[PDB]
């Protein structure tokens, strides 16, 4: 993929429960896999900011629940490093549901976003309320 323009310490694992920052109808999401990743023996597969993950819907509307969909990580508690040395961290862990073409499934995003996510998913960013 295109370079993020920042270093990321993955703060999420396979099985992690995170926040779905949108209005698709899904509230809580569970990470199942990370696109393009292949780890090593005994290592629990990891995900972080700017990564595209496969997810299952834990909470939300009856229809959205149990559905296996794709998503993009937008915010994470573990710190990341900007090119100027400064560290940046968020209040929670969140991702936005997305389709085959990387276009947000919902109509609106809930909460802030990392400027770095724009360099990868412009159509997701071009729906952002706040880009920090």
């Amino acid at each position: 993929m295109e370079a993020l323009g920042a270093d990321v310490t993955q703060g999420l694992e396979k099985g992690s429960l995170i926040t779905c920052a949108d209005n698709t109808g899904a509230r809580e999401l569970k990470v199942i896999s990370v696109h393009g990743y292949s780890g090593t023996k005994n290592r629990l597969p990891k995900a972080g900011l700017g990564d595209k993950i496969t997810v299952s819907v834990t909470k939300g509307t009856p229809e959205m629940r149990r559905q296996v969909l794709e998503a993009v990580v937008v915010r994470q508690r573990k710190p990341i490093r900007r090119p100027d040395g400064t560290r940046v961290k968020f209040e929670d862990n969140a991702a936005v549901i997305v389709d085959e073409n990387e276009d947000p499934r919902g109509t609106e995003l809930k909460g802030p976003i990392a400027r770095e996510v724009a360099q990868r998913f412009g159509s997701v960013a071009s729906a952002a309320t706040m880009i920090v």
Partner: protein, 53 residues
């Protein structure tokens, strides 16, 4: 830059930037300031703080 807590100057190539739920932003100079804030304390009430001084 200047620490949004103690007020001293943040040495370049140093510090952290916490992003709040609403999208607000707080640049910290050191862990000490981060931790005092987490206790619910306010820089103006601490004598060692430039803000307070």
């Amino acid at each position: 830059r200047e620490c949004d807590y103690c007020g001293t100057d943040i040495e370049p190539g140093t510090g952290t930037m916490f992003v709040h739920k609403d999208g607000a932003t707080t640049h910290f100079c050191s862990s000490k300031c981060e931790n005092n804030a987490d206790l619910g304390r306010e820089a103006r009430n601490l004598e060692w703080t430039d803000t307070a001084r």
